[PDB]
Design a protein around this motif. Structure first.
Motif, PDB file in Angstrom:
ATOM      1  N   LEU A 108      27.600  -6.260 -84.950  1.00 19.91           N
ATOM      2  CA  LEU A 108      27.953  -5.208 -84.005  1.00 19.91           C
ATOM      3  C   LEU A 108      29.198  -4.435 -84.426  1.00 19.91           C
ATOM      4  CD1 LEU A 108      25.997  -4.879 -81.679  1.00 19.91           C
ATOM      5  CD2 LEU A 108      26.167  -7.306 -82.262  1.00 19.91           C
TER       6      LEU A 108
ATOM      7  N   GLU B 288      18.376  -6.517 -78.160  1.00 18.46           N
ATOM      8  CA  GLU B 288      18.128  -5.120 -77.814  1.00 18.46           C
ATOM      9  C   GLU B 288      18.237  -4.220 -79.040  1.00 18.46           C
ATOM     10  OE1 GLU B 288      16.896  -4.176 -75.222  1.00 18.46           O
ATOM     11  OE2 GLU B 288      17.417  -5.538 -73.581  1.00 18.46           O
ATOM     12  N   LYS B 289      19.266  -4.435 -79.862  1.00 22.50           N
ATOM     13  CA  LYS B 289      19.447  -3.613 -81.054  1.00 22.50           C
ATOM     14  C   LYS B 289      18.291  -3.797 -82.029  1.00 22.50           C
ATOM     15  CE  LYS B 289      22.924  -2.446 -84.555  1.00 22.50           C
ATOM     16  NZ  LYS B 289      24.269  -2.775 -85.103  1.00 22.50           N
ATOM     17  N   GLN B 290      17.823  -5.036 -82.195  1.00 23.35           N
ATOM     18  CA  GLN B 290      16.696  -5.295 -83.083  1.00 23.35           C
ATOM     19  C   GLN B 290      15.434  -4.608 -82.582  1.00 23.35           C
ATOM     20  OE1 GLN B 290      16.064  -9.451 -83.923  1.00 23.35           O
ATOM     21  NE2 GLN B 290      13.954  -9.135 -84.620  1.00 23.35           N
TER      22      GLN B 290
ATOM     23  N   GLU C  91      22.551  -8.519 -76.766  1.00 27.50           N
ATOM     24  CA  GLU C  91      22.813  -7.237 -77.411  1.00 27.50           C
ATOM     25  C   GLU C  91      22.082  -7.134 -78.744  1.00 27.50           C
ATOM     26  OE1 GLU C  91      24.122  -5.037 -75.801  1.00 27.50           O
ATOM     27  OE2 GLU C  91      24.682  -3.422 -77.178  1.00 27.50           O
ATOM     28  N   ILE C  92      22.088  -8.217 -79.525  1.00 27.31           N
ATOM     29  CA  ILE C  92      21.411  -8.220 -80.817  1.00 27.31           C
ATOM     30  C   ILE C  92      19.909  -8.063 -80.633  1.00 27.31           C
ATOM     31  CG2 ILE C  92      20.712  -9.781 -82.671  1.00 27.31           C
ATOM     32  CD1 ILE C  92      23.261  -8.449 -83.382  1.00 27.31           C
TER      33      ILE C  92
ATOM     34  N   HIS D 182      29.905   1.445 -78.714  1.00 29.58           N
ATOM     35  CA  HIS D 182      28.482   1.673 -78.959  1.00 29.58           C
ATOM     36  C   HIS D 182      27.661   0.436 -78.595  1.00 29.58           C
ATOM     37  CE1 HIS D 182      29.556   5.398 -81.081  1.00 29.58           C
ATOM     38  NE2 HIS D 182      30.509   4.687 -81.659  1.00 29.58           N
ATOM     39  N   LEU D 183      27.891  -0.072 -77.386  1.00 30.74           N
ATOM     40  CA  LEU D 183      27.148  -1.210 -76.845  1.00 30.74           C
ATOM     41  C   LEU D 183      26.686  -0.882 -75.429  1.00 30.74           C
ATOM     42  CD1 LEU D 183      29.679  -3.944 -78.019  1.00 30.74           C
ATOM     43  CD2 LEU D 183      27.637  -3.191 -79.239  1.00 30.74           C
TER      44      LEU D 183
ATOM     45  N   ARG E 265      15.307  -1.902 -80.735  1.00 31.75           N
ATOM     46  CA  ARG E 265      15.480  -0.470 -80.950  1.00 31.75           C
ATOM     47  C   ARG E 265      15.271  -0.106 -82.415  1.00 31.75           C
ATOM     48  NH1 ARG E 265      20.527   3.139 -78.408  1.00 31.75           N
ATOM     49  NH2 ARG E 265      19.513   5.168 -78.721  1.00 31.75           N
ATOM     50  N   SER E 266      15.785  -0.933 -83.329  1.00 32.05           N
ATOM     51  CA  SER E 266      15.610  -0.667 -84.753  1.00 32.05           C
ATOM     52  C   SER E 266      14.143  -0.749 -85.151  1.00 32.05           C
ATOM     53  CB  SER E 266      16.441  -1.649 -85.577  1.00 32.05           C
ATOM     54  OG  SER E 266      15.951  -2.971 -85.437  1.00 32.05           O
TER      55      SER E 266
END
Ligand SMILES: Nc1ncnc2c1ncn2[C@@H]1O[C@H](COP(=O)(O)OP(=O)(O)OP(=O)(O)O)[C@@H](O)[C@H]1O
Ligand SMILES: Nc1ncnc2c1ncn2[C@@H]1O[C@H](COP(=O)(O)OP(=O)(O)OP(=O)(O)O)[C@@H](O)[C@H]1O
Ligand SMILES: Nc1ncnc2c1ncn2[C@@H]1O[C@H](COP(=O)(O)OP(=O)(O)OP(=O)(O)O)[C@@H](O)[C@H]1O
Ligand SMILES: Nc1ncnc2c1ncn2[C@@H]1O[C@H](COP(=O)(O)OP(=O)(O)OP(=O)(O)O)[C@@H](O)[C@H]1O
Ligand SMILES: [Mg+2]
Ligand SMILES: [Mg+2]
Ligand SMILES: [Mg+2]
Ligand SMILES: [Mg+2]
Lengths: 246, 246, 246, 246
Positions: free
Chosen positions: A12, B49-51, B46-47, B13-14, B53-54
């Protein structure tokens, strides 16, 4: 689980959080703290580090030769300038007022020091700043025009909120390139301030740029809304030299 | 102080951390486990969600028309293909082995379904994937060449780790442009896998590209390290049509 | 004193000598042979390391995609070419004789493998080598000409002692650009050998370049002093594929 | 094997090491010496020779007309200068302090000799040095600017750690080019020392450059960090003339 926390922090983009994760965990364990307060403290520390890094990067990108500030300015050695006006400048009101700042006077009286102090203050408050000398700016614009990319360099010199033009007058400008300077003064006219330091009076600008009419137009645009400081007194460099000798 | 937390989370940016900050704080207050574990859970969410989205962004950038998976492939309807080999493909060993995949057989037997399944699995494990039809690939390459930017499009079609060429054979390739295909097959040879779906046997490729020698060169390059599936059986589209009628 | 030795070794640009200084000193102390022989061994090791680094740099500047050698070549699978001729080529007599080497035959029979073997052998013995495909060479020459600096890239293609041109025939060269290739064949004519791998017979080269006269001139200049190899047999790629299946 | 050692030494750019190889081998054989200590001695000798050659090459690159040193300076004949200050200068503390050194007085009193001695001392301790006369510097800068390469020559004049400007005042500078000199003083200010010798007082510098304001700025920048020596006494050339006559 600790390794997973470290990996997530690094992913992050939170390196300092990972570095201080153990210390903050120990602090929270030893002393009872609410989760909200702990997260607030951690995020505030991260934001402080991020802002410091951003300010350092901005200072790197502003090409300031030697960082200086008003705190090191000795107004007692320069009574020719009213410190009240300098403090008013440090408010950065001129940035919102679209007013240029013209420093004038003999060599070694703090013109460049004051300009760099104002630029540093602008950088601290997040205002984009760019420092350059008149000769360097003219040469760079001429080279960019010779390469058919004058617009890119003009954007480079116009984007910064505070553009500092140092030593306008010591080196006579090539007349064929003088107009380049005008363009900047024309494109920052009522758009962004210019902090211009010189030792030449306005009436002599025609000699500096080699074009009386262009010099008059530049002066009309530059002095339309600006603060003019006519500093006086003995050169500070010679003062320090005498102090060392004595 | 909570608003400061929200602002810091937005600046870092979270967005999801800011959105779910209150819920997780309430859970931690009501249920106390540990500060380290609380941060671990927050960062894991958070990870995730980011994964997600990626992965969605990769799917959008991979030009996949529709999203399929091996789960929806009923091997009972197509006994001609051994599920073991498909499962072996899903391990993505061919990516490390630089092996190409070729699907052959009549229409409606799952060739494109399997190709898209492999591409989706590759995107799941983070491998860049791209999907394109042979006709569209050739047309885009020709248009780029006409505009003097064939190299950019060639890089675009060579960058992806797994490139899927779909419907190579239904439309005969323009002889003046079929060579473009070879270039891609030449540049990814022993560098990145290619998943090519077609209904034409290898010996017939000469008809498709209008050049027997070029077809043979392409086949030798593509079949050097490759896994060739010759699927059979009645079309699945007609199977669904019969089921709907019956 | 040992720190001074390390500093002196680093100053003389002998990193490996400094790194292995302790090991060689220990060997000399435990095993005594001679000061002269000890220095001989040290300098031989340093020379070997320097030669390895120079070969790596040349390969970096030689543009060799994959490294192959005659040792891994199985003439049993390719009996159509006499191993004696390949061994004669390995002597690099063609470099002094100004003789080119042309490989012709069906795809995937070892032509490129032999060309890269010859290039690597030449690189080992200190000869400058450069490998490229015909289409890429033509594209680069065309782009250089469009930028008004064709001669620079022409020298870059002429400076290397051994120039290898691969894939001449699989892709037809642009008639407006094929002449560029001719220029190279003209500039290296009896100046430096060329190793050209192709699948098309000489008489068909016109279709590759779109000009019978230009193709005839290129063939005459290339074949005036050259060694022609006509290989045959099943493509080794298909043999490997069958072995993998079987 | 000895020939191999010689070839390796020459290839590793160690000429002197090879030249004395036999002598060192005989010395080691006659008297038992550890290999580590023998290599230390050899590398020390090679480093000493390299340092001597580097110093000589630097002297050649720095246009010093005649080589001198402090040891050859007679303070008895010039009591107007305190030897203590000269010895303090020889420590090269001014280089760390960024302090200039100005020599003033009648011609032939040793100003040039002292400047050359300081330059030689700086060269010996590994500090880059450059020597030039003011007229030559101005002419070279003017010629470089007329060719559109002023920046390169400016770097050439700024790169040296110690720049020596000899005979500033004997020949009046062209008013259109005096600014060039200022540029050096403007760029070496607070960056590198300048050793300037002159027979004219500071107040007359405006006459030398033909511009009072530019001369004042140059003096302010030069004297900010400088050590000023006002040498007096009879001309040394005339003293030698009288001694020869008498
Ligand atoms: N009042 C002052 N207080 C502290 N430092 C000062 C003051 N005036 C000048 N200095 C320092 O003296 C040196 C020269 O001053 P400065 O560069 O600001 O002058 P200037 O008017 O820009 O000169 P010039 O015309 O030569 O460019 C710098 O180190 C500056 O920091
Ligand atoms: N065994 C199967 N299980 C589930 N869906 C299937 C199966 N076979 C085919 N389908 C579906 O039938 C439709 C047609 O199949 P698909 O496009 O994969 O066939 P194809 O041989 O690649 O076709 P074409 O030659 O027309 O491009 C798709 O929706 C595919 O998902
Ligand atoms: N006799 C052989 N022994 C070992 N490997 C071989 C042999 N012949 C071919 N190969 C291998 O087959 C593959 C293709 O052969 P190669 O690289 O020589 O291409 P080529 O026949 O010159 O190609 P093209 O005709 O497309 O230019 C390479 O892996 C090469 O190593
Ligand atoms: N005290 C001295 N001891 C030894 N040599 C000296 C001394 N003074 C002068 N000389 C020598 O006399 C010659 C002229 O002196 P030098 O050039 O150093 O003086 P200067 O003041 O710089 O001269 P000018 O202004 O005339 O060029 C040189 O050879 C210098 O070495
Ligand atoms: Mg200034
Ligand atoms: Mg399909
Ligand atoms: Mg080949
Ligand atoms: Mg002199």
């Amino acid at each position: 689980m600790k390794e997973r926390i470290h990996e997530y922090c690094h992913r992050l983009h939170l390196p300092v959080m990972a570095e201080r994760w153990s210390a903050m965990a120990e602090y929270a364990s030893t002393h009872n703290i609410s989760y909200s307060e702990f997260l607030f403290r951690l995020l505030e520390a991260e934001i402080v580090e991020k802002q410091a890094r951003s300010i350092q990067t901005l200072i790197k990108l502003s090409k300031l030769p030697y960082r200086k500030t008003i705190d090191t300015f000795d107004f007692t050695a320069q009574p020719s300038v009213d410190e009240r006006r300098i403090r008013e400048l440090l408010t950065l009101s001129f940035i919102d007022r679209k007013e240029n700042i013209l420093f004038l006077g003999p060599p070694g009286i703090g013109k460049t020091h004051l300009a760099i102090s104002i630029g540093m203050e602008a950088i601290a408050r997040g205002y984009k700043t760019y420092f350059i000398t008149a000769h360097d700016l003219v040469n760079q614009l001429r080279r960019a025009d010779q390469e058919g990319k004058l617009e890119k360099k003009l954007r480079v010199f116009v984007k910064p909120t505070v553009l500092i033009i140092d030593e306008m007058g010591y080196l006579k400008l090539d007349p064929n390139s003088a107009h380049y300077l005008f363009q900047v003064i024309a494109r920052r006219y009522e758009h962004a301030p210019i902090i211009l330091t010189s030792n030449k009076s306005f009436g002599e600008w025609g000699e500096i740029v080699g074009d009386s009419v262009l010099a008059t137009a530049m002066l009309d645009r530059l002095l339309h809304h600006s603060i003019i400081f006519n500093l006086k007194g003995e050169s500070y460099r010679l003062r320090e030299k005498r102090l060392q000798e004595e």
